[PDB]
Write a protein that binds this ligand. Structure first.
Ligand SMILES: Nc1ncnc2c1ncn2[C@@H]1O[C@H](COP(=O)(O)OP(=O)(O)OP(=O)(O)O)[C@@H](O)[C@H]1O
Ligand SMILES: [Mg+2]
Lengths: 103, 51, 43, 103
């Protein structure tokens, strides 16, 4: 490796009871390059890199990424439910207020 | 402190491949040259043009 | 009772403003992360 | 290394599914020097060290630093919301008090 101009490392790691593929450029002389461990998935169309991981805890890969996405969706949905319930509460208070005014 | 390493001292730059040891050495050499001083860069890994 | 109604109106508008601000901040943070891990830095 | 007057160690670590660069002076004879693992980022302008990490959990680097900053912003904002809601509550109590006095 002492001479190589470019270095590409391909990893096949076992995590979460399943194997995931990744690759990254350990070094690329005379140019700037991405420093992300881009997970890829080989298929009939060839070697294809998955879209970059976005969000905290980017180390997640494979099934863990889908699980994290689902958890985020659930939590943000329930936050929306929180805000909606508060709005409905203020709804109720205003209704009593102006009905009382009518009386 | 002092603005830099003492002159005439031995400086080691350690790191894994792709860390930037050659980049730091080139920075040192270029900074020395910019002040009108002479500099030599012995390279046992790359050609002059590639570097 | 009308004073109560005005207070409730202020509360609703505070709810809308702060919620929209949270929306905006979330979008900004997502964009920041998108750059931090994005390849658009080169093309 | 047994003879070297100054030692600079450059690290390219893989953490959070991505690679980050850092450097630190392992030793600098006859002078006092910073003892911080200063993360840097090489670019066209040259080698440039990022501003020092401020706040607890300084080990965070790369995307994790931005994530921590965002989390801190969110939490402190919600604390501000807490205090504002308490102030509005006392607002309401005072309004009833002096309206009752008026009656
Ligand atoms: N314009 C650039 N922007 C960002 N990073 C760059 C740029 N040009 C080069 N690099 C980085 O510089 C790295 C090479 O640095 P350098 O040659 O100083 O390392 P080194 O430790 O001497 O390497 P080696 O073990 O191969 O001798 C490249 O892998 C790339 O990551
Ligand atoms: Mg080199």
């Amino acid at each position: 490796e002492e001479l190589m101009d470019g270095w590409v490392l391909m990893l096949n790691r076992e995590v979460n009871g399943e194997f995931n593929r990744e690759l990254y450029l350990l070094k690329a002389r005379g140019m700037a390059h991405s420093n992300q461990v881009r997970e890829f998935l080989m298929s009939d169309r060839g070697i294809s890199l998955l879209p970059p991981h976005l969000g905290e805890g980017g180390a997640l890969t494979g099934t863990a990424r889908k699980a994290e996405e689902a958890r985020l969706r659930r939590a943000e949905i329930e936050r929306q439910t929180e805000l909606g319930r508060l709005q409905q509460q203020i709804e109720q208070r205003r209704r009593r207020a102006r009905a009382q005014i009518e009386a | 402190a002092g603005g830099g390493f003492f002159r005439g001292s031995s400086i080691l730059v350690s790191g894994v491949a792709g860390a930037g040891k050659s980049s730091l050495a080139a920075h040192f050499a270029a900074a020395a040259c910019a002040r009108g001083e002479r500099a030599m860069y012995f390279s046992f890994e790359e050609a002059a043009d590639q570097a | 009772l009308e004073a109560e109604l005005q207070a409730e109106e202020i509360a609703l508008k505070a709810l809308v403003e702060s919620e929209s601000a949270h929306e905006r901040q979330r979008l900004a943070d997502a964009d920041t992360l998108a750059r931090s891990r994005g390849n658009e830095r080169f093309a």
